[PDB]
């Protein structure tokens, strides 16, 4: 499965976070994708956005939709999975189905220091405009 290079992926995601999948929510029959409630640990990018655009449950829980999206290589998860999520707030035309949800934009990444480092680096590199 061909996946875009880290640089482009970081460009196309206004929010990058880390967290553990607590539970699988309902399904989206129109796009054949699903949602899960995620307990965030820390944001590697876009925190300010989530703060102003997403209503948080439990102070540290969000809901990401878009899982199982064919156009993404690593798009599956299970209860307890830990990942680095490249997301974006759901557009309004995806409402009210995906209202107040962050939408998976690209392949999920495993929580390893190498990844955390590389992502942070690419995030900081681009933050140099
Ligand atoms: Cl991808």
Curated annotation (Swiss-Prot):
Organism whose genome encodes this protein: Gallus gallus (Chicken)
UniProt site positions, description: Cleavage: 115-116, 128-129
Glycan attachment positions: 105
Residue ranges occupied by any NtA domain in the UniProt entry: 1-129
Function: Is involved in modulation of growth factor signaling. Involved also in the regulation of neurite outgrowth probably due to the presence of the glycosaminoglcan (GAG) side chains of heparan and chondroitin sulfate attached to the Ser/Thr- and Gly/Ser-rich regions. Also involved in modulation of growth factor signaling.
Name of the protein this chain belongs to: Agrin N-terminal 110 kDa subunit
Disulfide pairings: 1-73
Section of the entire sequence shown: 26 to 154 of 2081
